[PDB]
mmCIF file of N, CA and C in Angstrom:
data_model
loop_
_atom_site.group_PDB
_atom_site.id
_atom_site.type_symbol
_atom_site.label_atom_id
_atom_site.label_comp_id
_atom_site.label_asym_id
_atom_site.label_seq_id
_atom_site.Cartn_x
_atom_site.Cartn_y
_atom_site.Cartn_z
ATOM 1 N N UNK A 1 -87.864 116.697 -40.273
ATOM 2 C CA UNK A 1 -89.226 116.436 -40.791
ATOM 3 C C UNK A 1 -89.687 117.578 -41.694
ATOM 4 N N UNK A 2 -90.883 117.304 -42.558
ATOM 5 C CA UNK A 2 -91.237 118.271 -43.187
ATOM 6 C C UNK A 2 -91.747 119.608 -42.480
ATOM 7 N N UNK A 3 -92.266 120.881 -42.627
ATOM 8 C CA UNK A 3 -92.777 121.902 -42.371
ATOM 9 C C UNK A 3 -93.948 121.825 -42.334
ATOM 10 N N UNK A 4 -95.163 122.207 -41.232
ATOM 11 C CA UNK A 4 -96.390 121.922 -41.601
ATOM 12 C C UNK A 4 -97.219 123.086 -41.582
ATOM 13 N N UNK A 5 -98.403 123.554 -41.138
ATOM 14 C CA UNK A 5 -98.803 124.902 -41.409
ATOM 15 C C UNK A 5 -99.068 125.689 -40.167
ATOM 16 N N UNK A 6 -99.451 126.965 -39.945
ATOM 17 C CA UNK A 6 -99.313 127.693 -39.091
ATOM 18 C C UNK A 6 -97.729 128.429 -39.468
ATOM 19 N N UNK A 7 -97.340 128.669 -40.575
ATOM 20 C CA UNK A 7 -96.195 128.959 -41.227
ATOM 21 C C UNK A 7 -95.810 130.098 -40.054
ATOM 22 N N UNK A 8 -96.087 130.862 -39.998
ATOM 23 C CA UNK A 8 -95.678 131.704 -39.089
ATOM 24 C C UNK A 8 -94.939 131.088 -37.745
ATOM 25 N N UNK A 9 -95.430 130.657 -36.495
ATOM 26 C CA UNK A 9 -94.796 129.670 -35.834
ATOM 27 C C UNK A 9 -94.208 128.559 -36.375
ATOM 28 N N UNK A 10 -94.874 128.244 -37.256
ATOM 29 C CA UNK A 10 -94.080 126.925 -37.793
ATOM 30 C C UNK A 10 -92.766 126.982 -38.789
ATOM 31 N N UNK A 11 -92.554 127.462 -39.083
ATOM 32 C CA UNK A 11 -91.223 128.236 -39.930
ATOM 33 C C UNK A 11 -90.307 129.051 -39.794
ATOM 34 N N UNK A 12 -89.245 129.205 -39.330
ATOM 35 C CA UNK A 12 -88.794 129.957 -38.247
ATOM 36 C C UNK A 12 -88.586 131.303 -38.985
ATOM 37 N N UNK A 13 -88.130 131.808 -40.106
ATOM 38 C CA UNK A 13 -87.465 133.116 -40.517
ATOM 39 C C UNK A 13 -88.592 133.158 -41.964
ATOM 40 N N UNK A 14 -89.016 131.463 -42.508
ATOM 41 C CA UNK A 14 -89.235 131.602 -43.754
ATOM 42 C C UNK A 14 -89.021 132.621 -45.342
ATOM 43 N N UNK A 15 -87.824 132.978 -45.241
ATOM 44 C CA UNK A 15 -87.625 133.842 -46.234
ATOM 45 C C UNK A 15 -87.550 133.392 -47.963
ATOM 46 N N UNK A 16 -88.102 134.017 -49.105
ATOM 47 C CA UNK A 16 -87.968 133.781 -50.243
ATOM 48 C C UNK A 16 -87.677 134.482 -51.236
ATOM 49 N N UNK A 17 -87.433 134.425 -52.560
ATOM 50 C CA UNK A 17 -86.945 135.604 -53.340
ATOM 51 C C UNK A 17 -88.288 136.789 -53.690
ATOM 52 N N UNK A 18 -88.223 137.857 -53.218
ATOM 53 C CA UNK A 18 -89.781 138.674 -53.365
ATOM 54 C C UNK A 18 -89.370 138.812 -54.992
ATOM 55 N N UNK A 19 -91.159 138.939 -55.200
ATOM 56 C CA UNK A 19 -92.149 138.984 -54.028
ATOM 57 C C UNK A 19 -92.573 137.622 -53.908
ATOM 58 N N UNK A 20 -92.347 137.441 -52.098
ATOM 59 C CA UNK A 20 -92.954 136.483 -51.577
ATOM 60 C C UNK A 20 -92.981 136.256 -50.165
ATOM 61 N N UNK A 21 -93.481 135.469 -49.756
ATOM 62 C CA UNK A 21 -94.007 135.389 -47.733
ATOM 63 C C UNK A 21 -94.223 134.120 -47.244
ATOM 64 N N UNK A 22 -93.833 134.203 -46.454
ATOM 65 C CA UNK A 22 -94.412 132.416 -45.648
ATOM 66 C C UNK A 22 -96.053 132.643 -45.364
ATOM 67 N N UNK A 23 -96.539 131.361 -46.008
ATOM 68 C CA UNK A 23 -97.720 130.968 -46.157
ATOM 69 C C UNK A 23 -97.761 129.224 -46.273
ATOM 70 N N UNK A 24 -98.762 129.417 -45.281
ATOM 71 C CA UNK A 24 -99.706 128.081 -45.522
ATOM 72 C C UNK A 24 -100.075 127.032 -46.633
ATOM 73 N N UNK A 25 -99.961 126.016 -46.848
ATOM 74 C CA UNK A 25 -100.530 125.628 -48.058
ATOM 75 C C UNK A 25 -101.365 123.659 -47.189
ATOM 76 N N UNK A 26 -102.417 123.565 -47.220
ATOM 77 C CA UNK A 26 -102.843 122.807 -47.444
ATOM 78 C C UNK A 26 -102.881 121.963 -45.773
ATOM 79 N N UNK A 27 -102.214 122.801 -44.850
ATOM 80 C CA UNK A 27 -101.541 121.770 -43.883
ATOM 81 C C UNK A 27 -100.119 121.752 -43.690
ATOM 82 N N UNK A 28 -99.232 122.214 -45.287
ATOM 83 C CA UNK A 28 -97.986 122.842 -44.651
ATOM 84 C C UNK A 28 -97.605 124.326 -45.383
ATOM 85 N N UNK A 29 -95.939 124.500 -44.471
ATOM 86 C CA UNK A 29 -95.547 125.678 -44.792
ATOM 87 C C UNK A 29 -94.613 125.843 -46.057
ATOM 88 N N UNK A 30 -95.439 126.570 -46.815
ATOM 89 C CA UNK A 30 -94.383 127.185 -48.337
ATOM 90 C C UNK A 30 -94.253 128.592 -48.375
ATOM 91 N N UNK A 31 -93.383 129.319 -49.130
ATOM 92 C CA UNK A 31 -94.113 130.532 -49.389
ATOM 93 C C UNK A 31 -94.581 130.929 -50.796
ATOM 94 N N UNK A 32 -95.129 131.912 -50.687
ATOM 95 C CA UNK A 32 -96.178 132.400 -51.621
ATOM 96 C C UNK A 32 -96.173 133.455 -51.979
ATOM 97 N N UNK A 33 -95.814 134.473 -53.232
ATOM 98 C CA UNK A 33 -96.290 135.838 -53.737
ATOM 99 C C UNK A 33 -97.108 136.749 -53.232
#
């Protein structure tokens, strides 16, 4: 299923190319700068 928000619990490692962080968006989890 998709990822939803609470990115932190909800995303397990969320890693991205920095700069960037697991974050929230809207209800789910993306990351973000």
């Amino acid at each position: 299923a998709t990822k939803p928000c609470q990115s932190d619990k909800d995303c397990k490692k969320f890693a991205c190319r920095k700069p960037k962080v697991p974050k929230c968006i809207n209800g789910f989890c993306k990351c973000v700068r």
